[PDB]
Nucleic acid binder design. Sequence first.
DNA 1: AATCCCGGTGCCGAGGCCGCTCAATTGGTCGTAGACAGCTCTAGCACCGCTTAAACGCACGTACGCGCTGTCCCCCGCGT
DNA 2: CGCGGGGGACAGCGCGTACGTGCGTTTAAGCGGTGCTAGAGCTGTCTACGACCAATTGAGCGGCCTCGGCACCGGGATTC
Lengths: 97, 98, 105, 103, 95, 96, 82, 82
Amino acid sequence: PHRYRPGTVALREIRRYQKSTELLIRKLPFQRLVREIAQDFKTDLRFQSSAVMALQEACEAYLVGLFEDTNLCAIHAKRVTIMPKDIQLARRIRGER
Amino acid sequence: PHRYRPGTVALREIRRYQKSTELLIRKLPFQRLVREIAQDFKTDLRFQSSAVMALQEACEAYLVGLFEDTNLCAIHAKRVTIMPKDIQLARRIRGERA
Amino acid sequence: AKTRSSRAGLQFPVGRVHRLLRKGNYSERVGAGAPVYLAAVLEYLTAEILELAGNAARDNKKTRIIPRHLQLAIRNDEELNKLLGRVTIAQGGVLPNIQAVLLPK
Amino acid sequence: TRSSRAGLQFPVGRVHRLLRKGNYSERVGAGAPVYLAAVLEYLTAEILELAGNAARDNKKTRIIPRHLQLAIRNDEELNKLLGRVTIAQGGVLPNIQAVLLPK
Amino acid sequence: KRSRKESYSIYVYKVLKQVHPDTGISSKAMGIMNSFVNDIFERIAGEASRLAHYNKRSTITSREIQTAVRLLLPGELAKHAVSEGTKAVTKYTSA
Amino acid sequence: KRSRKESYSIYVYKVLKQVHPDTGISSKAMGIMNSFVNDIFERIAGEASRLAHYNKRSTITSREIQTAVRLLLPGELAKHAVSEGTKAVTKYTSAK
Amino acid sequence: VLRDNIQGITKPAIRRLARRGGVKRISGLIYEETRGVLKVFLENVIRDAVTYTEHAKRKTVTAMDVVYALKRQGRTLYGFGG
Amino acid sequence: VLRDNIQGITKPAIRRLARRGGVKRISGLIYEETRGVLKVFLENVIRDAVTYTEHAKRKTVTAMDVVYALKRQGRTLYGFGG
DNA sequence: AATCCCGGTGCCGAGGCCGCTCAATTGGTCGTAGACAGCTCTAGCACCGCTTAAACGCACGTACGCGCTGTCCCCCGCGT
DNA sequence: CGCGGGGGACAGCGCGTACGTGCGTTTAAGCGGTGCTAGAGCTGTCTACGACCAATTGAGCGGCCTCGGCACCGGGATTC
């Protein structure tokens, strides 16, 4: 029936998620990842629910800002698509490596 | 006569200047630049020689490292030549540029 | 005028700031003017952010400042954005900014 | 002296003095300066080993700042600890990007 | 009867009512403002501590806070903050 | 007259003689080690100061210095430094 | 047992994070790369949060442990204490 | 009077710095771009150093003022009094 | 088509008051950090000229930037 | 999760030129030697300013309830 050209809904999603502040990772998969990573550090650990929310607020903010630098790396190479080489350039310059 | 292919002495200079540690900017031009910039903040100022040396050590290390990131940006664009766009991308990622 | 805040013409507590300065191991001795100066500076910066955040709330047809209004205010003001450059505002989001080369021609 | 009782070359008394003089807390435990002076001695340690090796690799018998820079920037963990540190008269590591080499 | 947890909420409400008498603030927004005040508190106080240590002073006076504001705040923000602080100290000293 | 400024110069020499008895050091390189020791001192002491405040304690004990080393130092450097710390503390209390 | 949990960070979830960052087109290799990045990030922060938690002689990681850890890495977080 | 001193940071001086940075080929517009960046770097550093000197009530900027300013900006320098 | 602005509804957190308490304020003593004037002695500035290594400027062409094209498939859109 | 096709990635090529290289010309950096005094650093006295202790007082917090700003939405307005 109707079909948007590729890039139209992507731009539409950029404006949508730059308007809101909600977390974009589903809470249960993220919490299971936190408990597993922490379990490989120390067994039998309990988490305040706010401690998981604090870890998710920072991680999403870190990845959002990282995707910003990643997007700039792609555009510098006259590209529109971000690639793993763009992330690694950003983290290298950031001093993260 | 005799002529090396373009890029050969550039590499000889890279190997040379990555082997040494002496400063690469002439000391007196750098010193006069420091005094001019400082005057625009406070008039009638004197500088310790070690303070200017500290400023030159820091600035050149900053510039050398910035040229490393700049070189990575040019290589990222399938290029061998560094360009102002590479510096602006590097500083943008560094958080210095907005 | 019994309070040190009224004595300084401030809304911020001079007494509490003087306490925190002593119970903070910043120096052996804390002058009498130091808490007053700091509480006023804290008050000025507070007013500067709430001014821009109340404006952002009004632009969004809102009477309450929510965290996004603080984020819009700080990241749109050059000096506020620099003062909080290494700061993360919870539930603040980002500024709408799409790069030019991504726009359709 | 407290350094000998702990088996250290670094001064335990000076470290205890600086810990109280520096407004870090009300009180400083008796073990804190010993522990801290041993860690300081161990890191001072770790740099002097790798910097003395660099001096020998460069046919020197005396450590100059470049030897300290070579030691730190070639060691992964020392380079991370001093990631935001500039070593005066240290220079850089010789490293030319590959695409710049003639083929 | 839960534990006393101090905050800057009452003063943020007061300043907000001076600048926006009909405007409000949510829980999360108040938590960020509380974290903002604590952050800038620690930044200024930390710089003041270093200044006193650099000059072998046992005292942090309003002069240390002033220079800390100059090193920490950007241009216009420091300018107004310096005047609003000196204004409060002058009043406090006389009365 | 004269003025007195302290530095770790004598202890770095004593430590240098351990790994490299046949190798010396310049004054510039000596000033870098002095900056290095001071900088690492500040970073551990500052981290230990926050540890005590976080847990509402007025004392910085070896346990605070131990935790500060594990937050600051990376992996193997930290394991090694904890070994030094605990060893020297044991030898010190066993020589009261 | 718990295993492979990093896959809980799904492809559409990484997509939404890229959109808020202003990303239009995403390569296929980004998703596994982003998982490695997030894991390194979580490892560095949780390591410090647990180190604080252990020093406090607790078995529960508090939000203050995370906030103190985020401030350690230079990624200060507002709205959860401190 | 003193005027145009930034040009004293010459083209071959910038070239040597780029060589030590591992750069093989340098655009012509690089040299003026590098002069603006170095100016901002020195501006931010010297501004903080002068603020330290003023607080010490001195007319001579010490290397410690420079060291303290570099540490402020997250560019710590060893070998000058750190 | 998809998204927006509008008028109605609805509920729970703001923003306010109640009253208790503990942090601030007040009045006061003691001593010391540091202000201040005095003094000396380092190093920072100035200036000059003999030397020459470095910088400047131009000429030449080589190989790299980038603009074009062409293909092939890797993401975007969309219904279930 | 799959389906289907569209445009972006990428590779190949070719043109146009900018930048590397070399030499001759030109400029001022570096050297070390001398002279001058400003300003740092050391020094020496007096005292004002802050800690420190005790006793009184209200500023500030938790606990409290009611109330309205706004999250929610179903319909109509608009803008790509």
